[PDB]
Coordinates of C-alpha atoms in Angstrom, one line a residue:
Chain O
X1 CA 160.8 37.5 -2.4
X2 CA 162.4 39.6 -0.4
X3 CA 165.5 38.0 -0.9
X4 CA 167.4 39.7 -4.2
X5 CA 168.5 37.4 -6.7
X6 CA 173.0 37.0 -7.3
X7 CA 172.9 38.1 -10.7
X8 CA 170.5 41.4 -10.2
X9 CA 172.5 42.8 -6.9
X10 CA 172.8 46.1 -6.8
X11 CA 175.1 46.9 -3.9
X12 CA 179.1 47.5 -3.8
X13 CA 181.4 44.8 -4.3
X14 CA 183.1 46.1 -1.5
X15 CA 183.9 45.4 2.8
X16 CA 183.0 49.0 4.3
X17 CA 184.1 49.1 7.5
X18 CA 181.2 48.8 9.6
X19 CA 181.2 45.3 7.9
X20 CA 185.0 44.6 8.2
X21 CA 184.4 45.5 12.2
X22 CA 181.6 43.6 12.6
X23 CA 183.0 40.5 10.6
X24 CA 186.3 40.7 12.7
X25 CA 184.3 40.5 15.5
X26 CA 181.7 38.1 15.5
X27 CA 184.7 35.8 14.3
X28 CA 187.0 37.0 17.4
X29 CA 184.3 36.2 19.9
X30 CA 183.5 32.5 17.3
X31 CA 186.8 31.8 18.2
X32 CA 187.1 32.3 21.2
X33 CA 184.0 30.1 22.3
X34 CA 185.7 27.3 20.4
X35 CA 185.1 27.3 16.7
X36 CA 186.8 25.7 14.4
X37 CA 189.8 28.0 12.6
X38 CA 189.8 27.5 8.7
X39 CA 193.5 28.6 7.9
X40 CA 196.3 27.2 9.9
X41 CA 198.3 29.1 12.7
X42 CA 201.5 29.6 13.0
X43 CA 202.4 31.1 16.6
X44 CA 199.5 33.2 16.9
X45 CA 197.3 33.2 20.1
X46 CA 194.8 36.1 19.7
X47 CA 191.4 35.9 18.6
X48 CA 191.8 39.1 16.8
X49 CA 194.6 38.1 15.2
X50 CA 193.4 34.8 14.5
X51 CA 190.0 36.6 12.8
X52 CA 192.0 38.7 10.6
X53 CA 194.4 36.3 9.3
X54 CA 191.3 34.3 8.2
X55 CA 190.0 37.8 6.7
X56 CA 193.2 39.0 4.6
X57 CA 192.9 35.2 3.2
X58 CA 189.2 35.2 2.7
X59 CA 188.5 32.1 4.7
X60 CA 185.9 33.8 7.3
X61 CA 182.6 31.4 6.9
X62 CA 180.3 34.2 7.2
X63 CA 177.1 36.0 4.8
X64 CA 176.9 40.1 4.9
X65 CA 172.6 40.2 4.4
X66 CA 172.4 44.3 3.3
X67 CA 169.1 46.0 4.0
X68 CA 167.7 48.0 1.4
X69 CA 165.2 51.0 2.9
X70 CA 161.8 48.8 1.3
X71 CA 162.9 45.9 3.1
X72 CA 164.6 43.8 0.8
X73 CA 167.9 42.6 1.2
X74 CA 171.2 41.1 -0.5
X75 CA 172.7 38.3 1.1
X76 CA 176.9 38.4 0.1
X77 CA 179.8 35.6 0.8
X78 CA 182.8 37.7 3.2
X79 CA 184.2 35.1 0.7
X80 CA 183.5 37.3 -2.8
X81 CA 183.3 41.1 -0.9
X82 CA 186.6 43.1 -1.9
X83 CA 188.6 44.1 1.2
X84 CA 191.0 46.3 1.1
Chain D
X1 CA 187.5 70.4 -2.9
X2 CA 188.1 66.9 -4.7
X3 CA 188.7 63.7 -4.1
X4 CA 192.4 61.9 -5.3
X5 CA 194.6 63.8 -5.9
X6 CA 196.4 63.8 -9.4
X7 CA 199.6 66.0 -8.7
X8 CA 200.9 63.9 -6.0
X9 CA 199.4 60.4 -8.4
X10 CA 201.0 62.3 -11.8
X11 CA 204.3 62.7 -9.2
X12 CA 204.5 59.2 -7.7
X13 CA 204.2 57.7 -11.4
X14 CA 207.7 60.5 -11.9
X15 CA 209.5 59.3 -8.5
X16 CA 208.6 55.5 -9.5
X17 CA 209.6 55.3 -13.6
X18 CA 212.3 57.3 -13.4
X19 CA 210.6 59.9 -16.5
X20 CA 213.8 61.8 -16.0
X21 CA 216.3 62.6 -19.5
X22 CA 214.8 63.2 -22.2
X23 CA 214.4 60.1 -23.3
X24 CA 211.1 59.8 -26.1
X25 CA 207.9 58.4 -25.4
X26 CA 206.6 55.3 -26.7
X27 CA 202.8 56.5 -25.3
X28 CA 200.7 56.3 -29.1
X29 CA 198.2 58.8 -28.9
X30 CA 195.1 56.5 -29.7
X31 CA 196.1 55.1 -26.2
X32 CA 196.1 57.9 -24.2
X33 CA 192.7 59.0 -25.6
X34 CA 191.2 55.7 -25.5
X35 CA 192.4 55.0 -21.9
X36 CA 191.5 57.9 -20.4
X37 CA 187.8 58.1 -22.5
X38 CA 187.6 54.3 -20.6
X39 CA 188.6 55.6 -17.5
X40 CA 186.1 58.2 -17.8
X41 CA 183.3 55.4 -17.5
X42 CA 184.6 53.2 -14.7
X43 CA 184.0 56.5 -11.6
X44 CA 181.4 54.0 -10.1
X45 CA 179.1 56.2 -7.7
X46 CA 176.1 54.0 -8.4
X47 CA 175.9 50.9 -9.3
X48 CA 173.6 49.1 -12.1
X49 CA 172.4 49.1 -15.7
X50 CA 168.9 51.3 -15.2
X51 CA 168.9 54.5 -17.2
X52 CA 167.8 56.7 -14.6
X53 CA 171.1 55.3 -12.6
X54 CA 173.3 55.6 -15.3
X55 CA 171.9 59.6 -15.9
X56 CA 172.9 59.9 -11.9
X57 CA 176.4 58.3 -12.1
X58 CA 176.4 60.7 -15.2
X59 CA 176.3 63.4 -12.8
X60 CA 177.3 62.5 -9.9
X61 CA 181.4 62.9 -11.1
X62 CA 181.4 65.6 -13.7
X63 CA 182.9 68.0 -11.9
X64 CA 185.9 65.1 -11.0
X65 CA 185.7 64.0 -14.8
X66 CA 186.6 67.7 -15.8
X67 CA 189.3 68.0 -13.9
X68 CA 190.6 64.3 -14.7
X69 CA 190.2 65.0 -18.6
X70 CA 191.9 69.0 -17.7
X71 CA 194.9 66.9 -16.1
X72 CA 195.3 64.4 -18.5
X73 CA 195.3 66.1 -21.9
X74 CA 197.5 64.6 -24.8
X75 CA 199.7 67.5 -25.4
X76 CA 200.4 68.3 -21.5
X77 CA 200.9 63.9 -21.0
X78 CA 203.5 63.8 -24.1
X79 CA 205.3 67.0 -22.9
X80 CA 204.5 68.2 -19.6
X81 CA 204.7 64.9 -17.9
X82 CA 206.6 62.7 -20.3
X83 CA 204.9 59.7 -19.2
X84 CA 205.7 56.6 -20.9
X85 CA 203.3 53.6 -21.5
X86 CA 203.4 51.8 -18.0
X87 CA 203.3 54.9 -16.6
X88 CA 200.2 55.3 -17.9
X89 CA 198.8 52.6 -16.9
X90 CA 199.8 52.7 -13.6
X91 CA 198.4 56.0 -13.0
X92 CA 195.1 55.2 -14.7
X93 CA 194.7 52.1 -12.3
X94 CA 195.8 54.6 -9.4
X95 CA 193.1 56.9 -10.5
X96 CA 190.6 53.9 -10.2
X97 CA 191.3 52.5 -7.6
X98 CA 191.4 56.1 -5.1
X99 CA 188.1 57.1 -6.1
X100 CA 186.6 54.0 -5.6
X101 CA 188.4 54.2 -2.0
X102 CA 187.2 57.8 -1.2
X103 CA 183.2 57.0 -1.8
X104 CA 181.3 57.2 1.4
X105 CA 180.2 53.6 3.4
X106 CA 176.8 52.4 3.8
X107 CA 175.9 52.6 7.4
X108 CA 177.3 56.4 7.8
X109 CA 175.6 58.1 10.5
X110 CA 175.6 61.6 8.2
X111 CA 173.3 63.3 10.3
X112 CA 175.1 63.5 14.1
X113 CA 178.5 64.4 11.3
Chain G
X1 CA 203.9 18.5 13.9
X2 CA 207.1 20.6 14.0
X3 CA 209.4 17.3 13.4
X4 CA 208.4 15.0 10.5
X5 CA 210.9 11.6 9.6
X6 CA 210.5 9.7 6.4
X7 CA 212.3 6.1 8.3
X8 CA 215.6 7.9 9.1
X9 CA 215.4 11.3 7.4
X10 CA 214.2 14.0 9.6
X11 CA 212.5 17.1 9.1
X12 CA 211.4 20.0 10.4
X13 CA 208.5 21.4 7.9
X14 CA 207.0 20.1 4.8
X15 CA 208.3 22.0 2.4
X16 CA 211.5 20.8 3.5
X17 CA 210.3 17.1 3.7
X18 CA 208.8 18.1 -0.4
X19 CA 212.0 19.2 -1.1
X20 CA 215.1 17.5 0.4
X21 CA 213.8 13.7 -0.1
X22 CA 211.0 14.0 -2.9
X23 CA 212.5 16.1 -5.2
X24 CA 215.9 14.4 -5.6
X25 CA 214.2 10.8 -5.2
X26 CA 212.4 11.7 -8.3
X27 CA 215.8 13.3 -9.9
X28 CA 217.5 9.4 -9.2
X29 CA 214.0 8.0 -10.5
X30 CA 214.8 10.2 -13.7
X31 CA 218.2 9.1 -13.6
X32 CA 217.2 5.4 -13.6
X33 CA 215.2 5.8 -16.6
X34 CA 217.2 7.9 -18.8
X35 CA 219.9 5.3 -17.7
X36 CA 221.2 2.9 -20.9
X37 CA 220.3 -0.3 -19.0
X38 CA 216.5 0.6 -18.2
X39 CA 213.6 -0.9 -19.5
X40 CA 210.3 0.2 -18.1
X41 CA 208.2 -2.4 -19.9
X42 CA 206.3 -5.6 -18.2
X43 CA 208.9 -7.9 -15.9
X44 CA 208.0 -11.2 -18.2
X45 CA 209.1 -9.5 -21.4
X46 CA 212.0 -7.5 -19.5
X47 CA 212.9 -11.6 -18.5
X48 CA 212.2 -12.6 -22.4
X49 CA 214.4 -9.8 -23.7
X50 CA 217.4 -10.6 -21.7
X51 CA 217.3 -14.2 -22.2
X52 CA 217.0 -13.1 -26.0
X53 CA 220.2 -10.6 -25.4
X54 CA 222.0 -13.3 -23.5
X55 CA 221.8 -16.4 -25.7
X56 CA 223.0 -13.7 -28.9
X57 CA 225.3 -11.7 -26.8
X58 CA 226.7 -15.4 -25.0
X59 CA 230.2 -13.9 -24.4
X60 CA 229.1 -10.8 -22.2
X61 CA 226.6 -10.9 -19.1
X62 CA 224.0 -8.7 -19.3
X63 CA 222.1 -7.2 -16.7
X64 CA 219.1 -4.6 -17.0
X65 CA 217.0 -2.2 -14.7
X66 CA 212.9 -2.6 -14.2
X67 CA 210.1 -0.7 -12.1
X68 CA 209.1 -2.1 -9.6
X69 CA 205.6 -2.9 -9.6
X70 CA 204.4 -4.8 -6.6
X71 CA 206.8 -2.5 -4.4
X72 CA 206.4 1.3 -5.5
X73 CA 209.8 3.9 -5.1
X74 CA 212.0 0.7 -6.1
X75 CA 213.6 -0.9 -8.8
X76 CA 214.4 -5.0 -10.1
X77 CA 218.1 -5.7 -10.9
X78 CA 218.2 -8.4 -13.7
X79 CA 221.6 -9.9 -14.5
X80 CA 222.1 -13.1 -16.3
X81 CA 225.9 -13.9 -16.3
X82 CA 225.6 -16.7 -19.3
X83 CA 222.8 -17.9 -21.2
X84 CA 222.7 -21.1 -19.1
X85 CA 222.6 -19.2 -15.7
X86 CA 219.4 -18.4 -14.2
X87 CA 217.7 -14.7 -14.3
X88 CA 219.1 -13.2 -11.2
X89 CA 216.8 -10.6 -9.7
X90 CA 218.3 -7.4 -6.9
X91 CA 216.4 -4.6 -5.1
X92 CA 217.5 -1.6 -5.1
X93 CA 215.0 1.7 -3.6
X94 CA 215.2 4.8 -5.3
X95 CA 216.8 6.7 -2.5
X96 CA 217.3 11.1 -2.1
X97 CA 220.8 10.4 -2.2
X98 CA 220.7 7.7 -4.5
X99 CA 220.5 3.9 -4.9
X100 CA 220.3 1.3 -2.3
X101 CA 221.8 -2.0 -4.1
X102 CA 223.2 -5.1 -1.3
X103 CA 222.6 -2.2 1.7
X104 CA 225.4 0.1 -1.0
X105 CA 224.4 3.7 -1.3
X106 CA 225.3 4.6 -4.8
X107 CA 224.8 8.4 -6.1
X108 CA 224.4 7.6 -9.1
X109 CA 223.7 5.0 -11.9
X110 CA 226.6 4.5 -13.3
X111 CA 228.5 4.0 -9.9
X112 CA 226.0 1.7 -9.3
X113 CA 226.7 0.1 -12.2
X114 CA 230.1 -0.4 -11.1
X115 CA 229.4 -1.1 -7.4
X116 CA 227.2 -4.1 -9.0
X117 CA 230.0 -5.7 -11.6
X118 CA 232.4 -5.1 -8.4
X119 CA 230.5 -6.8 -6.2
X120 CA 230.1 -9.8 -9.0
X121 CA 233.6 -10.3 -9.8
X122 CA 233.9 -9.9 -6.0
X123 CA 232.2 -12.6 -5.0
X124 CA 232.5 -14.8 -8.2
Chain C
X1 CA 199.6 55.3 46.6
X2 CA 201.4 54.6 43.2
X3 CA 204.8 55.5 44.1
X4 CA 207.4 52.5 43.0
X5 CA 209.8 52.5 45.6
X6 CA 213.2 54.3 45.6
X7 CA 215.6 51.5 46.0
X8 CA 214.1 49.9 42.8
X9 CA 216.4 52.6 40.7
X10 CA 219.3 50.6 42.0
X11 CA 218.9 47.4 43.2
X12 CA 218.3 44.4 40.8
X13 CA 215.6 41.7 40.9
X14 CA 217.3 38.2 41.1
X15 CA 215.2 37.0 37.5
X16 CA 216.6 40.1 36.3
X17 CA 219.9 40.2 34.4
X18 CA 222.0 42.8 34.6
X19 CA 223.7 42.8 30.9
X20 CA 221.2 41.6 28.1
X21 CA 222.9 41.2 24.4
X22 CA 221.2 40.8 21.9
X23 CA 222.9 41.2 17.9
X24 CA 221.7 43.5 15.3
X25 CA 221.5 42.2 11.9
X26 CA 220.5 44.6 9.7
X27 CA 224.0 45.9 9.7
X28 CA 227.4 43.4 10.2
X29 CA 229.0 43.2 13.3
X30 CA 226.5 45.4 15.8
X31 CA 225.1 44.4 19.1
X32 CA 222.2 46.0 21.5
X33 CA 223.2 46.3 24.6
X34 CA 220.6 46.9 27.6
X35 CA 221.3 47.5 30.7
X36 CA 219.7 47.1 33.6
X37 CA 219.3 49.9 37.5
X38 CA 221.7 51.8 35.4
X39 CA 221.6 55.4 34.3
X40 CA 223.6 58.4 32.5
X41 CA 226.2 58.1 34.5
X42 CA 227.9 54.7 33.0
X43 CA 226.0 55.3 29.8
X44 CA 227.8 58.7 29.2
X45 CA 231.0 57.4 30.5
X46 CA 231.4 53.9 28.1
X47 CA 230.2 55.7 25.5
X48 CA 232.3 59.5 25.5
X49 CA 235.5 56.5 25.5
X50 CA 234.0 53.8 22.8
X51 CA 233.7 57.0 20.4
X52 CA 237.4 57.5 20.6
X53 CA 238.2 54.0 19.4
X54 CA 238.9 54.0 15.7
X55 CA 237.9 50.2 15.5
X56 CA 234.7 51.6 17.0
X57 CA 231.9 53.2 14.1
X58 CA 228.8 53.6 15.8
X59 CA 227.8 54.1 19.5
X60 CA 224.9 55.0 21.4
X61 CA 222.5 54.6 24.0
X62 CA 219.1 56.1 25.0
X63 CA 217.4 55.7 28.0
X64 CA 213.8 55.4 27.0
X65 CA 212.0 56.7 29.6
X66 CA 212.8 58.4 32.9
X67 CA 210.6 56.5 35.3
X68 CA 212.5 53.5 34.7
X69 CA 215.8 52.9 35.4
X70 CA 217.8 51.6 32.2
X71 CA 218.7 52.3 29.0
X72 CA 219.7 50.4 26.1
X73 CA 223.3 51.0 24.1
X74 CA 224.0 50.4 20.2
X75 CA 227.6 49.2 19.5
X76 CA 229.3 48.6 16.1
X77 CA 232.5 47.6 15.5
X78 CA 234.9 47.2 12.1
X79 CA 235.2 43.9 10.5
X80 CA 238.5 42.3 12.7
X81 CA 237.2 43.2 16.3
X82 CA 234.1 42.1 17.9
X83 CA 232.1 44.8 19.7
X84 CA 232.1 43.1 22.7
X85 CA 235.5 43.1 23.4
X86 CA 236.0 47.1 22.5
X87 CA 233.4 47.4 25.3
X88 CA 235.8 45.6 27.5
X89 CA 239.3 47.6 26.4
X90 CA 236.9 50.9 27.1
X91 CA 235.9 49.7 30.7
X92 CA 239.4 48.8 31.7
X93 CA 240.5 52.0 30.0
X94 CA 238.1 54.1 32.3
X95 CA 239.3 51.8 34.9
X96 CA 243.1 52.9 34.5
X97 CA 242.1 56.3 34.2
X98 CA 240.3 56.6 37.4
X99 CA 242.6 54.8 39.0
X100 CA 246.0 57.7 38.3
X101 CA 243.4 60.3 38.9
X102 CA 243.1 59.4 41.7
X103 CA 246.6 58.9 42.6
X104 CA 247.3 61.9 41.4
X105 CA 245.0 63.8 43.3
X106 CA 245.9 62.2 46.9
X107 CA 249.5 63.3 45.9
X108 CA 248.2 67.0 45.5
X109 CA 246.1 66.3 48.6
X110 CA 249.6 65.5 50.2
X111 CA 250.9 68.6 49.4
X112 CA 249.0 71.0 50.0
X113 CA 247.3 69.7 53.2
Chain M
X1 CA 229.4 35.7 -17.6
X2 CA 225.6 36.8 -17.0
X3 CA 224.8 37.0 -13.2
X4 CA 222.8 34.9 -11.2
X5 CA 219.2 35.8 -9.1
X6 CA 219.1 33.2 -6.8
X7 CA 215.1 31.8 -5.8
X8 CA 213.4 30.1 -2.5
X9 CA 212.7 25.8 -3.6
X10 CA 209.6 26.3 -1.4
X11 CA 206.5 25.3 -2.6
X12 CA 205.1 28.3 -0.6
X13 CA 207.2 31.1 -2.6
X14 CA 204.9 33.4 -4.0
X15 CA 208.0 33.8 -7.2
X16 CA 208.8 30.4 -8.6
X17 CA 210.5 29.1 -11.7
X18 CA 206.8 28.6 -13.7
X19 CA 206.4 32.4 -12.9
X20 CA 209.6 33.8 -12.6
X21 CA 209.8 35.4 -16.4
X22 CA 206.3 36.6 -16.8
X23 CA 206.8 38.4 -13.5
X24 CA 210.2 39.9 -13.6
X25 CA 210.3 40.4 -17.2
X26 CA 206.7 40.7 -18.7
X27 CA 205.3 42.9 -15.6
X28 CA 203.0 40.4 -15.0
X29 CA 201.8 38.4 -11.7
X30 CA 200.3 35.0 -12.4
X31 CA 199.5 33.1 -9.1
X32 CA 202.5 29.7 -8.6
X33 CA 199.9 27.6 -6.9
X34 CA 197.5 27.0 -10.4
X35 CA 200.7 27.1 -12.9
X36 CA 202.7 23.5 -13.5
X37 CA 205.5 23.1 -12.1
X38 CA 208.7 23.3 -14.1
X39 CA 210.7 21.0 -14.7
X40 CA 213.9 22.9 -15.7
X41 CA 216.2 24.5 -12.6
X42 CA 217.5 27.3 -15.1
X43 CA 215.9 30.4 -16.9
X44 CA 217.3 33.2 -18.7
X45 CA 215.2 36.7 -18.4
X46 CA 215.6 40.3 -20.6
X47 CA 215.9 43.8 -18.9
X48 CA 214.8 46.7 -20.4
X49 CA 216.7 50.1 -18.3
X50 CA 217.0 53.6 -19.2
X51 CA 220.4 52.9 -17.0
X52 CA 221.6 50.8 -19.6
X53 CA 221.8 51.1 -23.3
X54 CA 220.8 47.5 -23.9
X55 CA 219.1 44.5 -22.7
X56 CA 220.9 42.9 -19.9
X57 CA 220.2 39.4 -19.8
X58 CA 220.5 37.5 -16.5
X59 CA 220.6 34.1 -15.3
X60 CA 217.2 32.4 -12.6
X61 CA 218.2 29.6 -10.3
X62 CA 216.9 27.9 -8.2
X63 CA 218.7 25.4 -6.8
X64 CA 222.7 25.9 -6.6
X65 CA 223.8 22.3 -5.5
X66 CA 223.9 21.5 -8.9
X67 CA 225.1 24.5 -9.8
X68 CA 227.5 26.0 -8.2
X69 CA 230.4 24.1 -8.0
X70 CA 233.0 27.0 -8.8
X71 CA 233.2 29.8 -6.0
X72 CA 233.3 31.6 -8.6
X73 CA 229.8 31.8 -9.0
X74 CA 228.9 33.5 -5.8
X75 CA 231.0 36.6 -7.7
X76 CA 227.9 36.7 -10.1
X77 CA 224.7 36.6 -7.7
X78 CA 222.8 39.9 -7.1
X79 CA 219.6 38.7 -5.8
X80 CA 218.2 36.4 -3.6
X81 CA 214.8 35.1 -2.1
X82 CA 214.0 33.7 0.8
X83 CA 210.7 32.3 2.0
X84 CA 211.8 32.9 5.4
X85 CA 213.3 29.7 6.1
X86 CA 216.7 28.6 7.9
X87 CA 216.6 25.0 5.8
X88 CA 217.4 27.2 2.3
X89 CA 220.9 28.1 3.2
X90 CA 222.4 24.2 4.1
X91 CA 224.8 24.7 1.4
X92 CA 224.6 27.8 1.0
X93 CA 228.2 30.0 0.6
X94 CA 227.2 31.8 4.2
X95 CA 225.2 29.3 5.9
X96 CA 224.2 32.1 8.7
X97 CA 221.6 33.8 7.3
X98 CA 222.7 37.1 9.0
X99 CA 226.4 36.9 6.9
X100 CA 224.7 36.1 3.2
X101 CA 222.4 38.9 3.7
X102 CA 224.3 41.4 4.5
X103 CA 227.2 40.4 1.6
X104 CA 223.7 40.0 -0.6
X105 CA 220.8 41.5 -1.8
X106 CA 217.8 39.8 0.0
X107 CA 214.1 39.7 -1.5
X108 CA 211.1 38.7 0.0
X109 CA 207.7 38.2 -1.5
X110 CA 204.1 39.0 0.1
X111 CA 200.8 39.4 -0.5
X112 CA 199.7 43.0 0.6
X113 CA 198.5 43.0 4.2
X114 CA 199.7 39.5 5.5
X115 CA 202.0 39.3 8.3
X116 CA 206.2 39.0 7.9
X117 CA 207.1 36.2 9.2
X118 CA 209.8 36.3 12.7
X119 CA 212.9 35.6 10.9
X120 CA 212.2 38.3 7.8
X121 CA 212.1 41.0 10.6
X122 CA 215.0 40.1 12.1
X123 CA 217.2 39.7 8.9
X124 CA 218.2 42.8 6.5
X125 CA 215.6 41.7 3.9
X126 CA 213.2 44.2 1.3
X127 CA 209.6 43.5 2.0
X128 CA 207.7 43.6 -1.3
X129 CA 204.3 44.0 -2.0
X130 CA 201.6 42.4 -3.7
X131 CA 197.9 43.3 -4.1
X132 CA 195.5 40.0 -4.1
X133 CA 193.0 41.7 -6.3
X134 CA 194.6 44.8 -8.6
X135 CA 196.9 43.9 -11.5
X136 CA 198.7 47.3 -12.1
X137 CA 200.9 47.7 -9.5
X138 CA 202.9 44.4 -10.4
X139 CA 205.2 46.4 -12.7
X140 CA 205.9 49.3 -10.1
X141 CA 207.0 46.3 -7.4
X142 CA 208.7 45.0 -10.9
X143 CA 210.1 48.3 -10.9
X144 CA 211.3 48.4 -7.0
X145 CA 213.0 45.7 -7.4
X146 CA 214.5 45.9 -10.8
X147 CA 216.2 49.7 -9.1
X148 CA 217.7 47.7 -6.5
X149 CA 219.0 44.8 -8.6
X150 CA 220.6 47.7 -11.0
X151 CA 222.2 49.7 -8.3
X152 CA 224.3 46.5 -7.1
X153 CA 224.7 46.2 -11.1
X154 CA 226.3 49.4 -11.7
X155 CA 228.1 49.7 -7.7
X156 CA 229.6 46.3 -9.1
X157 CA 230.8 48.2 -12.6
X158 CA 229.5 45.0 -14.9
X159 CA 230.2 45.2 -18.4
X160 CA 227.4 44.5 -21.2
Chain T
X1 CA 185.5 -4.2 46.8
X2 CA 182.8 -4.1 43.4
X3 CA 180.8 -6.8 44.4
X4 CA 179.8 -6.2 47.8
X5 CA 176.1 -7.5 47.8
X6 CA 176.0 -10.8 49.2
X7 CA 173.4 -11.8 46.3
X8 CA 173.4 -15.8 45.6
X9 CA 174.8 -16.7 42.6
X10 CA 173.7 -20.6 42.7
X11 CA 173.4 -21.8 38.6
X12 CA 170.6 -23.5 39.4
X13 CA 168.7 -20.3 40.2
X14 CA 171.0 -17.1 39.0
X15 CA 171.5 -17.2 35.1
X16 CA 175.1 -16.3 35.5
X17 CA 176.0 -16.4 31.3
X18 CA 173.5 -13.9 30.6
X19 CA 175.0 -11.1 33.4
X20 CA 178.1 -12.0 32.2
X21 CA 177.2 -11.7 28.5
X22 CA 175.4 -7.8 29.4
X23 CA 178.5 -7.4 31.7
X24 CA 180.6 -7.7 28.0
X25 CA 178.0 -6.0 26.2
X26 CA 178.6 -3.0 28.4
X27 CA 182.4 -3.4 28.4
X28 CA 181.9 -3.5 24.4
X29 CA 179.7 -0.3 24.8
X30 CA 181.8 1.5 26.9
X31 CA 185.0 0.8 24.1
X32 CA 183.2 2.4 21.4
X33 CA 184.2 5.9 20.9
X34 CA 184.1 8.5 18.2
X35 CA 186.7 9.7 15.5
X36 CA 186.7 12.6 13.0
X37 CA 188.2 13.6 10.0
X38 CA 191.8 16.0 9.7
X39 CA 191.7 19.5 7.9
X40 CA 195.2 20.4 7.1
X41 CA 196.1 24.1 5.5
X42 CA 198.4 22.9 2.7
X43 CA 199.0 23.8 -1.3
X44 CA 199.7 20.5 -2.0
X45 CA 197.8 19.3 0.5
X46 CA 194.0 17.4 -0.5
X47 CA 191.9 15.5 1.3
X48 CA 191.6 12.0 -1.0
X49 CA 191.5 8.1 -0.4
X50 CA 194.6 6.0 -2.2
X51 CA 193.1 5.2 -5.2
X52 CA 191.6 8.8 -4.9

C-alpha cells in the first residue's frame, strides 16, 4: 500500500550527503559492535575507515527508506545508489 | 549566477587534449548538433514520465539551456574553441555530471539557512 | 594468512602463489602436451598404441607420455625397450620449475627426454 | 599549569633516538634526517656548510613548530657520494674550522693581554 | 625497435593483457575481472598523437622472464605498471623498486575514491584514477598516461 | 578430589553401569561443538564444493 514499487521509483538515484553520513555512522557503529565485515581489511583498524571502504565497494548491507510527504516511501539499497 | 562553469570546462578540455596547433578538427557538424540537443534533455532536476513533471523539468532548466546553447554553438566550437571529437564527448559528459552534482539535496533545512 | 605453503614452496600472497606456481605448472603442462611424444588418450589405448608401434619398429625403444587421470598434476611415462620387453610406466610430476622424474628436475620436455634416455643407458 | 618543563628543550628521553634517518624515495640518493632536541644553532651551521660542497645538490631544513625542540633536514647528493658521508664530512670540516678559530683567538688574546 | 610497456601479471591489476588494447588504444575501460584471460603475453598497440606525424607501434609485455633475455631490451622500456607488490621485481633489472622507479616511468591504476597502498605512496610513480560509473573520463586518463609516455619518447629521441 | 561423597557404590544396590553410561553421554556432549563457514574476498575465490 504505502510502499512504492521498484519500477515507479522517482526519487534521485544518488546518495545524498545526509544519507551518506548516516549510513557511514550506522555501519561504523555496527562494526564497532562486532558485526561481520563484508570486505577484506588490509591493515585498517578504524571502524569509520572500514565503513568507508565498504561503501566505496558497494558492499554495505543497508537499505535507505525515503519518506515522501504523504507518508508513502521508497526503499533503495545502498548497493544501487550512486555514490560520488 | 548559474550552475556549472562552462568556461572552466572548455579551457580544461583544451589543456587536457592539447587543442592548440593549426590542426583541423574531425568533428562533423551533425555530431555537434545532435550532441548538444541530446545534452539539453539529460539535465534531470525532476524524475518521472508524467506530462506535468516533464513540463516542470523543461521549465526548470530554461536559462541554463540558453547558456549552454549560447556557448556550444557550431561556429564557436569549430572556430573559437577548436575542439575535436574526444574533447567534445568529454565536455558533454562533464557538463552532465557537474549539473547532476549541483542539485539540492533532499533533507536540506533551507528555511534556517 | 600472511604466509602460504605449497609443499616446500613458500609464498606471501594469493597473487604471488598463483602467478609463480599455477601459471608455471600450466605452461609446463602445455609444453608436455605440445611435445611430439605426448598422447592424451586413455591409458589402455596408450598401451595398445605403444605395443603396436614397438612391434612395427622393434629396432628401437619407444617412449610416450600420457595424462595421470588418477593423480592430477602428474604424467605417466610409458616406455617399451623392445616388443619382448614389458611396458614400464614411470611417474612424472608437473612442477613450476619443470618435470620431476626419478627425483630429478628437468626444465623442459626435451631435457626430460634426454635425461630419461641417459637414465636408461646408465641402468642398462 | 600546562607549561612544559624547560629541560625538555635539551634533555633527551631514553626511548627517543637523537638522530633518525629515513630515505626519501621520490628522488634518487636522498635522505631525511630528524634531529631531536636541536634548533637553528646546529641546523643553520650544517646547512650552510653543506651548501658549499660540489657533490651536494639539495640541502634544506625546517623547524616544524617553535614549541617543539627538533628539526628535520633534507639532504640529496650526487650519484657517486652517499649523503651520510657528506654529512660526516661537513661535521668534521666545521670542527676543524672551530679548532683553528679557537687557536687564533687564544694567540691574539695572549698578544693583546 | 619498438618500445616495451610492462604490465603487472597480478590478478588484482586494473589493466591486464585482456583489456589493455581497448583501454590504452581505444580509450574504453572494461572491467578485467569479467574479461576472459588472455593466453598471449605479448600484444601490439597503435598510438595516435599530435606530437608525431605517424602512429607509433608499441609492444606490451606482461612477463619479462621469457622476453628479456637480453639487456638491450631494457633500453626500450617506456612504462611500468605495478600493483604495489614487491614480488613483481624479483627478476627485474633493478630488484629494488626505488631505483627501478627513478630509472623508469611507473604507473599505478586505482578506482576513484580508493585508498592508495602504502608501498605505492613510498615510490616515485604516477597515480591514475578511473571512475567506476562514468566512462567519459577514460579517454582523459589515457591521454594523461600517453602524455607522460610521449614525453619520455621525445626525450629519448626515438625514431619512427 | 572429585567424588568426595562416601556413597556406597556396591553393584548389588548401585547401578554403576547406568552412571558410567550417563558419564560418557555427558562427556560426549562436552566434546560436541559448533562450526561455521568461511568468507574470503578474492576475485578467483568461490564458495563451492570439490565437485561444484
